[PDB]
Amino acid sequence: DGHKLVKALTTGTTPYGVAIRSHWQTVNAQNQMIYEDGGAINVMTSGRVWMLSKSTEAPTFGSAVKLDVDGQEKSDGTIETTWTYAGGWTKYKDIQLVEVQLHQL
Amino acid sequence: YENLFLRPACPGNISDTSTYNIDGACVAQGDIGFGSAVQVVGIVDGVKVVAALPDGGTPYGIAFRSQYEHLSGKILDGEVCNVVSHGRVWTLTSLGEAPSLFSKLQFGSGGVVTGGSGSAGWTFAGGFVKHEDGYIIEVQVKQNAFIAPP
Amino acid sequence: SPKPFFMSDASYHVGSFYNDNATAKRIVDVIPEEMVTAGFKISGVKDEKEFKSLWDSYKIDPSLVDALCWARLYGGAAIVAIINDNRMLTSPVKPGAKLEGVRVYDRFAITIEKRVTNARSPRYGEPEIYKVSPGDNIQPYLIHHTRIFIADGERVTPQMRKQNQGWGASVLNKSLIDAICDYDYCESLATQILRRKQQAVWKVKGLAEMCDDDDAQYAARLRLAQVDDNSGVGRAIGIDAETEEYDVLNSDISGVPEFLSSKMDRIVSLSGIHEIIIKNKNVGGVSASQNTALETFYKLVDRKREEDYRPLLEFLLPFIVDEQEWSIEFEPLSVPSKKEESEITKNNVESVTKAITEQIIDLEEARDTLRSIAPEFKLKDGN
Amino acid sequence: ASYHVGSFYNDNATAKRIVDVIPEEMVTAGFKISGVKDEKEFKSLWDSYKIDPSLVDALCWARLYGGAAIVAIINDNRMLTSPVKPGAKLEGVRVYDRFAITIEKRVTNARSPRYGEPEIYKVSPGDNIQPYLIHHTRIFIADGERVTPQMRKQNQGWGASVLNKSLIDAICDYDYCESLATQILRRKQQAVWKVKGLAEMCDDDDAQYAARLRLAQVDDNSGVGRAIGIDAETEEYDVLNSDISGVPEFLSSKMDRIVSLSGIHEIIIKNKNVGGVSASQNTALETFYKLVDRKREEDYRPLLEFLLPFIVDEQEWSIEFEPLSVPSKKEESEITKNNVESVTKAITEQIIDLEEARDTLRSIAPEFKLKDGN
Amino acid sequence: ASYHVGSFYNDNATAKRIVDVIPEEMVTAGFKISGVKDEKEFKSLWDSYKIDPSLVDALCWARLYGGAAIVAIINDNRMLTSPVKPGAKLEGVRVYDRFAITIEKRVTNARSPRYGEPEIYKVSPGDNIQPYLIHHTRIFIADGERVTPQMRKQNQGWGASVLNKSLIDAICDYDYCESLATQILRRKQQAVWKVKGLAEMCDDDDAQYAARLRLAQVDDNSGVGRAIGIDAETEEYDVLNSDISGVPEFLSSKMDRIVSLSGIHEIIIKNKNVGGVSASQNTALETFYKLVDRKREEDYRPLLEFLLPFIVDEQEWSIEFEPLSVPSKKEESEITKNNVESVTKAITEQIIDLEEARDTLRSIAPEFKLKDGN
Amino acid sequence: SPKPFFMSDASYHVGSFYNDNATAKRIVDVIPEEMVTAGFKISGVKDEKEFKSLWDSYKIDPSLVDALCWARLYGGAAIVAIINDNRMLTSPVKPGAKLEGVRVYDRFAITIEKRVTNARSPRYGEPEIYKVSPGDNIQPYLIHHTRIFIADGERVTPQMRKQNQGWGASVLNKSLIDAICDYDYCESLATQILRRKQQAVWKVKGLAEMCDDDDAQYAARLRLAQVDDNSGVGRAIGIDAETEEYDVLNSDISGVPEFLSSKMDRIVSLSGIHEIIIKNKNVGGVSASQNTALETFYKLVDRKREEDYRPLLEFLLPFIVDEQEWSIEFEPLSVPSKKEESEITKNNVESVTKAITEQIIDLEEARDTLRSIAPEFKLKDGN
């Protein structure tokens, strides 16, 4: 059918999508929202989504998205991605978030 | 928040219920087979005239299977035709083995998939089954991917 | 899954399964004419001779029958009544008692012309003008709501109702459809198993050497068939020991009638009409259980009748009777017997005047009492 | 693997019967009203309003969705949000499903016993009409079956669908069993034909097409009266067979599970006479009547007290539910004979006089028409 | 694992029926009161109050959770904490489950026999309102079933659920049995295809995918009227089958265990008429009726002696429960004839006068109404 | 065995058996409840309306119910009655007829304090004073013999009667307990037999070469489960003839329902209360024998009632009745009904005065006679 098996991003790889909040969601040791090793995962491939970041400067509208090794937005990462920025930039409790527009690969 | 799968896996039909688009205001010149790429040769009164893909053309969509419009088994000259311009669809192929996931497909003559090393265009979606001593693949069609040369 | 933008499900499949298969004909047709021909009685009228005279003058009950038929099949039907009115056919009807015909249209022939949702009127949400497109090259003509009546089928979810422009659904849902469909498949497989009871095998070493489609192979096949047709219990066949062997293989057959009876029972269960009516076979082992089966069947048909037969009556009666207040009674749908009808007439005639002779109950009401329950005892109108 | 109940309702037939059989028969059973000066005009006015289709589908959607509403409009010179003044006026009633009704305003006054019960109902019919607000007295709410309160307040004080998970999957398993039985019948017999070197013949070519066409042709002409030829040295033709038994019994057991979970018995859900007994389905029916009346007393009467005082100007009245038993002419005549002889066999000697004997005889529903008078 | 009564009730239909079939019929049965001047106004007040659904729910939670509380509000000009002075007033009644009531104050003084009996009840309904206090006179409590005194004290004087462990696991085993039956029917027949060298296939390659493709395709086209060819040297095709029998009896035995442990019999729980006999199910239903009367005498009355003294100003009255029997229009007709013949067959010979004869004839509730008078 | 201290060890084995198992619940609560709810009637009293009024004013029947139940269960129970009197509860009771409260205790809360062996009074050899120790942080206290009454179960020989301190035994004897326990074992065995009906075996040469708890073995077992889940009638499984085989074996089931029916028969036969009251299943094969089974049940329950219910009557009634001589009679334990009561009352009213109009049997006592047999005919007292 085309059903796919997915895992975390690594070096020299091609990003596919971004996991989103859903019913299937577990808690890590540090109270972090995670997807367990065995189970269903929802991946959104087109549209606007809030994504974790570890940058320190507000991104410019429309510029290309550059990812980090572990799969989070970073201002000068070495992984190239087709997605774009949408302009949203905010900060949850001790967490940085950024608004990313994803195009279908 | 998930997308359902569609059951029949026959050539010429859609494979998923993701975002798709069907251009139903068209007519055919010549004969077309379900699951082949087509090209736009002209426009009359808001209607697009399509034909099977020649050498040197730019594909526009893929013929779509319907059980009322086409009672013969294929699309005939002078018939209204369904064409899929955006979405995942099962296509006829002459390849022998599945290409790399998310690669770029290349269309031989007659609108069949024969290449997996294109520069830009439609992409392989991960489905590869067997039909009639031949194979069927799953392609992801996007609207502005192939641009007509000036 | 992709689907046409002009949704149409009960358009061709229902009509095909109705006019081709017979069990569908029965399951959709047994009810309506039985309801309409059960009969009805009116109360509050001066007399009934003229009532029956006007009824069998108008002669509209076959139209009522097939109107209810299309209502049950296509999920909707309409009937238009024409009135002796000197006004344009768009206009409403003034009070009166007059009409010149009633004629029926199917679900496909009626649509809505304009809609009124005025707050003060309780008719908000009710389509006030119906646009009908008849057949046989007749131009469409819009109708005021007062003239026509719309009859629906069975209840559906409101979500489906609004999507189906306020119209019911067909009784032939896909579950009943494929339950009907696989019955023929099972019957065909049963006949195939009956054909395949016994087989014979004839083995001849070197038969592969035979040429394809030449005189030798044709001669061999002619000889084999010829010796096959003349064989039997009273005949013997000879073969060669070294070269050929003749064996017979057989298989048993049993349980097929029970399996088919189970399939028919499933058809009955999904239909809702019971055995001695849908299969029309008396069980035979019991003397008087078919009577209770048929009275349960009348329970079913009566509870269905109260839902749809009445609105037609309340729509037609005010145009035929000039009397101002009347009531509908439904005759007890049970066939009675010269024997027991004679007995019940005796019973009621002696009950009505066994003990009224000592009270103020006089002749002028005793006669109405005796001729109220429709007797075989006529009586000329008088004192 | 959870599916919305509406699709199952309007698709499957057994679900249709299970959800629909009770309310329609319940409402068509009828009733009588006591304390009324006369009943002819009562029936005339009742079938003048002719609201029973709306009543039927109101009860139906209350049974299915676990919640239904009826809006009753009245002749009054006030806005709909206002309460209803005393009187007996009615002009129309309409029916709305579970999804179009909510609660708006809260009352907690300890003085009235009305604390904890919604005061204003917020209706959102949709269909390009602005949602509006209605006072309590103008609306009645019909609920489904009883549920535990910890789920009741979680579901906004509303009932649950009568199609629970056990009923749903019990229904679903039956079709799977039927399909499996059909497969069992189809696979009764199998013919095997083996030929040395058959594997040498290559895929999807003319030789294979010819061979398989020949096999189909020879299979089409086999049977009792026809024989087939075989080469002994290379090829063999055998037949394997299997038996069938107990499938109807297993299907009957599954139907038993269906009827046990539904709670309505076989001659009503399967609608098949037992046939082996002539006078036991009558008590079967009376058990059905007892259960349906038991369920009716719970929920059908509230409509009666909701609507009846709004149409009758009389101060006092009562509801009696008609004896839900099929009435057979002959025994009806016999009962009428017994009643008429009892009512005046021994009143000739005491103060039981005609003005009340007539009332007694025309109260117990006779066929005896009698004009009012002394 | 599956022991939570709250979820089990609303997730299993059998639990639903087995828990609530009894009290609703109990209350709908009916009764009457002797020593009252008249009954018309009594029923008028009763159906004006319309608290029977709340009574049904209270009894249902009493049977399920082992304990429920019922609260009545009276027309009295004092604090709700204060006791109730003698009178006949009623305003409304509400019901709470086992989870909202507790104890505050004790009485253990010598002179009163009420020593050691609860005095003041702490009601904590929740619903964002302050929990409050109620005197013993206002609230009545309905219990479940008797237990050993040691468990009675351990459960702070509250009973136990009717769903004990034996009932729960007996119910659970039925689902396992039917699932095994479905698996049994699925595994009736199995086809095996043996090909020497098939092990040489590489895992998850085009060759293996095509092989299983062809296997499924050839399987889908077989049947009675179709044949399959194989190669004698390298492959063979076998079929193995197993029979089925006795599972209807097995499941019937499981259901019989369920009914025996429950105490409610087949024509009420399985809902099959026995069919092999004409008139024994009437005796079965009257056995059900005698047991339902036995349990009714235990728990339904206390509600009556708790509520009735608050509505009737009459001093001394008595209760009788209407004999539970389905009345047949016909048979009540003949019994009325018999009673009207017995009431005045020979009373015209002694001092028994019409003044008491009319009372006799209108006491046994007839279809003959009679205006009060001489 | 170690047990928690707050759960003091006193027959909690049988207590938990009672409060857990359902068949024990039925067998212990079936008799006393019906016994008490059967009702009774009293003769020699001026009137019975006030008797019933005071009776349901005191409303002690739930206490009587669980008193009898605990006496049947533990083999002993105590009922304590307090009277409106101006004396200490230790002293005896003077003549009078008063009640103010009555309460119940089980077997474990009662002991003997003072014993009498005086020669002249026949009362010697039975205890004089009872020491009750309710617990519940209230001091135990002492009761005179007359105030309270001790209810016992079934008779035992004097040899164990004397060692059980004049107290009977539990109705759940060893044989009954073991027979009840065996049924659950048989049911579990039946479930296992049904599960083990069919087995599939897969054989692969060299399969044992694989290390345990390893990647290859995990893959192989996942593949086995996957292919097992997808097999069926319409699906086939391929194997390799050279290396692996797939066999299936099966066993039948028969006689199990009869075996369990026989075990239930043993249970009911040893219990003594019969099938249509313990299994709650009508015989179904006959129309008019279950009623005779009922009257056998009523006869046995009446025989048991005569031994236990009366002592409560003669222990309590002398404290509530003011007149001197009375009779306690039991209603004939049979469910009456419309028909039979209607025609029986007809027979009584014709028998009471069909032929008495000729002799001295006159009206003032004829009315008393006719309303003595409890009729539906209410009558005002008078001449």
DSSP code per residue over C125-177: TEEEEEEE--SSS---EEEETTTEEEEE-B---HHHHHHTTS--B-S--HHHH
Residues of A with CB under 8 A from a CB of B: 1-4, 14, 20, 22, 42, 46, 104-105
Rounded to whole angstroms, the Cα distance separating F307 from F317 reads 17
**If we measure between CA atoms, which residue out of F132, F86, F85 comes closest to residue F106?**
F132
First to last CA, chain C: 77
Rounded to whole angstroms, the Cα distance separating D71 from D134 reads 9
Residues in chain C: 383
Does the beta carbon of C173 lie under 8 angstroms from any beta carbon of chain D?
A: yes
Contact criterion met (CB below 8 Å) for C168 and C86: no
Rounded to whole angstroms, the Cα distance separating E213 from B134 reads 13
At F192, list the tokens.
């296992």
Partner residue facing D226 (CB), from C158, C186, C228: C228
Does the beta carbon of E224 lie under 8 angstroms from any beta carbon of chain C?
A: yes
At D158, list the tokens.
């509303």
Rounded to whole angstroms, the Cα distance separating F292 from F272 reads 16
Contact criterion met (CB below 8 Å) for D131 and D123: yes
**If we measure between CA atoms, which residue out of F281, D255, F180 comes closest to residue E251?**
D255
Contact criterion met (CB below 8 Å) for D269 and D259: yes
Amino acid code (one letter) for B51: A
Contact call for E231 and D184, based on CB within 8 A: no
Q: Which residues of D touch B131 (CB under 8 A)?
A: none
Min Cα–Cα distance to chain D from F233, Å = 7
Q: Touching C: which chains, 3+ CB pairs < 8 A?
A: B, D, E
Q: Is D148 helix (H, G, I), strand (E, B) or coil?
A: coil
C300 sits in the region (left: phi over 0; alpha: psi -120 to 50; else beta) called alpha
Give the residue on A whose Cα is nearest the Cα of B5: A1
Rounded to whole angstroms, the Cα distance separating E355 from E365 reads 17
For the four alpha carbons of F310, F311, F316 and F317, in that order, the dihedral sign comes to positive
Residues 6+ apart with CB under 8 A from C185: D182
Per-residue CA distances from C127 to C71, C157, C344, D31 (Å): 19, 20, 50, 33
Give the strands of the sheet with E189-195, arranged side by side: E235-241, E189-195, F236-239
Give the residue on E whose Cα is nearest the Cα of D330: E330
Contact criterion met (CB below 8 Å) for F150 and F165: no
**If we measure between CA atoms, which residue out of E362, E328, E323, E319 comes closest to residue E40?**
E362
Partner residue facing C193 (CB), from D189, D222, D330: D189
Cβ-Cβ pairs closer than 8 A, B with D, add up to 3
The residue written with tokens 């109405």 in the block is C368
Angle formed by the axes of helices E165-186 and D247-262, nearest 10°? 140
Q: Is A102 helix (H, G, I), strand (E, B) or coil?
A: strand
Helix, strand counts (H, E) of chain B = 0, 10
Min Cα–Cα distance to chain E from B126, Å = 15
Q: Touching D: which chains, 3+ CB pairs < 8 A?
A: B, C, E, F
**If we measure between CA atoms, which residue out of F133, F33, D20 comes closest to residue C300?**
D20
At E336, list the tokens.
């009325």
**Torsion angle, alpha carbons of D308, D310, D312, D316, to 10:** 70
CA E218 and chain centroid, separation = 54
**If we measure between CA atoms, which residue out of E245, D237, D77 comes closest to residue F252?**
E245
**If we measure between CA atoms, which residue out of E171, D165, B13, D239 comes closest to residue C1?**
B13
Min Cα–Cα distance to chain E from C198, Å = 13
Rounded to whole angstroms, the Cα distance separating C14 from C16 reads 5
Q: Which residues of E touch C251 (CB under 8 A)?
A: none
Residues of D with CB under 8 A from a CB of B: 203-204
Q: Which residues of E touch B96 (CB under 8 A)?
A: 206
Cβ-Cβ pairs closer than 8 A, B with E, add up to 8
Rounded to whole angstroms, the Cα distance separating C108 from E221 reads 41
The residue written with tokens 């971004």 in the block is A18
Rounded to whole angstroms, the Cα distance separating F325 from E298 reads 31
Contact call for B22 and C2, based on CB within 8 A: yes
**If we measure between CA atoms, which residue out of F73, A64, D265 comes closest to residue E275?**
D265
Q: Which residues of B touch C3 (CB under 8 A)?
A: none
Q: Is F363 helix (H, G, I), strand (E, B) or coil?
A: helix
Angle at CA of residue C243, ends C242 and C248, nearest 5°: 105
Contact criterion met (CB below 8 Å) for D44 and D311: no
Give the residue on D whose Cα is nearest the Cα of F235: D183
Amino acid code (one letter) for D29: A
Contact criterion met (CB below 8 Å) for B114 and B137: no
Q: Is F274 helix (H, G, I), strand (E, B) or coil?
A: coil
Residue D197 phi, psi (nearest 5): 80, 5
Rounded to whole angstroms, the Cα distance separating C376 from B60 reads 84
H/E stretch holding C66 reads helix C61-74
Residue F333 phi, psi (nearest 5): -75, 85
Long-range contacts of F80-83 (CB under 8 A, 24+ apart): F80/F104, F80/F105, F80/F132, F80/F143, F80/F147, F80/F148, F81/F147, F81/F148, F81/F316, F81/F319, F82/E113, F82/F147, F83/F147, F83/F319
Does the beta carbon of E304 lie under 8 angstroms from any beta carbon of chain F?
A: no
Contact call for A2 and B125, based on CB within 8 A: yes
At E44, list the tokens.
């008028």
CA C141 and chain centroid, separation = 31
Rounded to whole angstroms, the Cα distance separating D332 from C63 reads 35
Q: What is the CA radius of gyration of chain C?
A: 33
Q: Touching F: which chains, 3+ CB pairs < 8 A?
A: D, E
At D301, list the tokens.
């009467």
Q: Which residues of A touch B123 (CB under 8 A)?
A: 105
Rounded to whole angstroms, the Cα distance separating C272 from D270 reads 7
Partner residue facing D305 (CB), from E28, E50, E224: E50
Contact call for A42 and B1, based on CB within 8 A: yes
Resolution value (Å, 1 decimal): 3.5
Amino acid code (one letter) for D149: P
Per-residue CA distances from A104 to A22, A49, B103, C224, D273 (Å): 21, 14, 13, 69, 62
At F228, list the tokens.
């097992």
Give the residue on F whose Cα is nearest the Cα of E240: F248
Contact criterion met (CB below 8 Å) for A25 and A41: no
Residue C266 phi, psi (nearest 5): -60, -40
Residues 6+ apart with CB under 8 A from F81: F99, F101, F102, F147, F148, F316, F319
For the four alpha carbons of E177, E179, E185 and E191, in that order, the dihedral sign comes to negative
Does the beta carbon of B2 lie under 8 angstroms from any beta carbon of chain D?
A: no
The residue written with tokens 């907690």 in the block is D108
Partner residue facing A14 (CB), from B102, B127, B142: B102
Give the residue on F whose Cα is nearest the Cα of D181: F233
CA D174 and chain centroid, separation = 20
Partner residue facing D236 (CB), from E16, E232, E327: E232
- C273-311 per-residue burial string, b: 16 or more CB within 10 A, e: under 16: bbbbbbbeeeeeeeeebbebbbbbbbebbbbbbbbbbbb
**If we measure between CA atoms, which residue out of F153, F135, F19 comes closest to residue E146?**
F19
At D151, list the tokens.
């789920």
Q: Is F25 exposed, middle or buried (0-12, 13-18, 19+ CB in 10 A)?
A: buried
Cβ-Cβ pairs closer than 8 A, B with C, add up to 5
The residue written with tokens 């018939």 in the block is B79
Does the beta carbon of E149 lie under 8 angstroms from any beta carbon of chain C?
A: no
Rounded to whole angstroms, the Cα distance separating E287 from F298 reads 13
Does the beta carbon of B133 lie under 8 angstroms from any beta carbon of chain D?
A: yes
Give the residue on D whose Cα is nearest the Cα of B133: D204
Amino acid code (one letter) for D351: I
Partner residue facing F380 (CB), from E287, E345, E356: E356
Rounded to whole angstroms, the Cα distance separating E159 from E162 reads 9
Residues of E with CB under 8 A from a CB of B: 206, 209-210, 213
Q: Which B-chain residues 79-98 have CB contacts (< 8 A) with chain C? A: none
Contact call for C1 and B22, based on CB within 8 A: no
Rounded to whole angstroms, the Cα distance separating E179 from F22 reads 26
Rounded to whole angstroms, the Cα distance separating D58 from D69 reads 7
The residue written with tokens 């060890």 in the block is F9
Residues of B with CB under 8 A from a CB of A: 1-2, 5, 9, 15-16, 19, 88, 102, 123, 125-127, 138, 140, 142
Mutant choice from D271, D347, D356 vs C, greatest count of C C-beta within 10 A: D271
Chains B and E lie in contact, requiring 3 or more CB pairs less than 8 Å apart: yes
Does the beta carbon of C242 lie under 8 angstroms from any beta carbon of chain D?
A: no
Give the bridge partners for B140, in sequence order: B88, B123
B132 sits in the region (left: phi over 0; alpha: psi -120 to 50; else beta) called left
At F11, list the tokens.
């027959």
Q: SS3 sequence, C202-267?
A: EEECCHHHCCCCCHHHHHHHHHHHHHHHCCCCCCCCCCCCCCEEEEEEECCCCCHHHHHHHHHHHH
Q: Which C-chain residues 178-197 have CB contacts (< 8 A) with chain E? A: 189, 192-193, 196
Q: Is B84 helix (H, G, I), strand (E, B) or coil?
A: strand
Contact call for A2 and B127, based on CB within 8 A: yes
**If we measure between CA atoms, which residue out of E298, E212, E342, E268 comes closest to residue E18?**
E268
- C218-235 per-residue burial string, b: 16 or more CB within 10 A, e: under 16: eeeeeeeeeeeeeeeeee
Min Cα–Cα distance to chain E from D257, Å = 8
Min Cα–Cα distance to chain C from B119, Å = 32
Residues 6+ apart with CB under 8 A from D121: D69, D101, D102, D103, D104, D133, D134, D135, D136, D139
Contact call for D281 and E273, based on CB within 8 A: yes
Q: Touching E: which chains, 3+ CB pairs < 8 A?
A: B, C, D, F
DSSP percent split of chain F into helix, strand, coil, nearest 5: 45, 15, 35
H/E stretch holding E181 reads helix E165-186
Amino acid code (one letter) for C178: D
The residue written with tokens 């909707």 in the block is C76
Chains A and F lie in contact, requiring 3 or more CB pairs less than 8 Å apart: no
Contact criterion met (CB below 8 Å) for C130 and C110: yes
Structure solved via? cryo-EM
DSSP A76: T
Residues 6+ apart with CB under 8 A from F264: E260, F183, F275, F279
Q: Which residues of C touch B14 (CB under 8 A)?
A: 2
**Residue D21 burial (CB count, 10 A):** 20
